[PDB]
């Protein structure tokens, strides 16, 4: 059962996206042939379109993809349900900028005040055990399910709550709703895997193995989940033209190996 969204803020945000879509750039994605990961740190992958080979910033593509799924599926999201507990006040302890209770509680308050809105339109379920005054017991029950078979990495979750309060403008409908979509998209994008020197003898076997496992995971994620979705529904905006670079024209390469 799909609910009709007649908000002017959502209509104007959709027009902004529709007007920004680059027809030729979208065609490259619509008919892509995924090759594999080029750089896990800089979030670069290789694809083939026609007989041309392209270098793609998948972190940028996924950002735009999840923002678009967010706008399209607004107020119609499935939920990702969460021994293990998730307390917002505990998540904000990672930041040294929030040294006082007033700074941390201001973030939680902004979110908690608009909990009905966040749960209805974004499926960001916020539950508090005690009374409405206690911000220390405010918990996150569920997150929106933007893509079937995809679960976002909760490494970026403390940053999502921090930016939900500090970065989102809750004083304007269009800026608030646009900001929440941007924060979900940023949380949903696959993590950067920073470069670890495998040849360095000083590093432990645990750090080397986990780096390999993190690389295998992103590779498996882009191939089986992210790129089939990018190929199926991604609409390329004009500003992503710099994040799509031609690295080879394969017909020009055939002549080099033609006569063996």
């Amino acid at each position: 059962e799909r609910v009709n969204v007649n908000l002017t803020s959502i209509k104007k945000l959709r027009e902004k996206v529709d007007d920004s879509i680059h027809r030729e750039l979208t065609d490259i994605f619509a008919n892509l042939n995924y090759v594999g990961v080029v750089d896990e740190e800089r979030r670069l992958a290789a694809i083939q379109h026609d007989l041309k080979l392209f270098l793609i910033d998948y972190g940028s593509v996924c950002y735009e993809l999840f923002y678009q799924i967010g706008l399209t599926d607004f107020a119609n999201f499935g939920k990702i349900n969460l021994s293990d507990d998730i307390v917002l006040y505990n998540l904000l302890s990672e930041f040294d900028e929030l040294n006082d209770d007033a700074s941390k509680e201001k973030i939680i308050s902004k979110i908690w005040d608009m909990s009905s809105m966040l749960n209805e339109y974004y499926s960001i379920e916020l539950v508090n055990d005690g009374l409405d005054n206690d911000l220390k017991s405010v918990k996150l029950k569920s997150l929106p399910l933007l893509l079937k078979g995809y679960i976002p990495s909760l490494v970026k979750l403390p940053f999502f709550i921090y930016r939900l309060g500090k970065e989102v403008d809750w004083e304007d409908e269009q800026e608030c709703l646009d900001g929440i979509l941007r924060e979900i998209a940023l949380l949903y994008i696959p993590d950067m895997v920073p470069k670890v020197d495998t040849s360095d003898a000083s590093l432990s076997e645990d750090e080397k193995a986990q780096f390999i496992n993190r690389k295998e995971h992103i590779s498996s994620l882009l191939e089986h989940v992210l790129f089939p979705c990018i190929k199926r529904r991604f609409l390329a905006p004009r500003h992503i033209l710099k994040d799509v670079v031609e690295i080879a024209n394969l017909p020009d390469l055939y002549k080099v190996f033609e006569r063996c």
Binding site: N6, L7, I107, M117, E175, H239
Partner: protein, 222 residues
Amino acid sequence: GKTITDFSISRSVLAKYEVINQVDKKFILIRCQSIHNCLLVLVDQHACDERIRLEELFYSLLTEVVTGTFVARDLKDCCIEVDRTEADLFKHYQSEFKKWGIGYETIETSLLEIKTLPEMLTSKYNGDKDYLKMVLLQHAHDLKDFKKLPMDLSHFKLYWWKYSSCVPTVFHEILNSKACRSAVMFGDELTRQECIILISKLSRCHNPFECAHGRPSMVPIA
């Protein structure tokens, strides 16, 4: 067309109030018919004045940037050593830094040659090349990591708050510190008329409920 009911309740709260007086030379006591969810509120005079000043400074900054009138003072003997990936990042965002008065060129091991800087940044930098690199890198990384969205000048009333998020962290920190230092302090004497003017200006703010450092400006006490 439809809207969301909870967005209008906060704005209408402060419009339904009247000033009683200054309390402990630190607060302004205010009072709220139709008091279903809204009575007595203590406003931090420093936080209040700081918020008024901050939004004036933010409006001046973004008006200067959007209209392309933002001053870019020429800088001499300023070349910073950058890595290949850093030089690539700066080459990529040259057009974006130009919008904020940060004018540079990428040479080649590579070197970043800063040609112009806004007066605001020239003051904060004060010859420290190490500080300027760190500050420009922070923004370039913020843009690259989708933490900051780029300044779109395709749109052109000027609602500064629609572009407030694009403002680099260094500019935000400078504007917060300027508004903080210019604001009325704890222990300062305020007449009832002065308190009335402060709460009047605050009620016309885009975000009257917090100071320049993300902490509340007022607390209900009834």
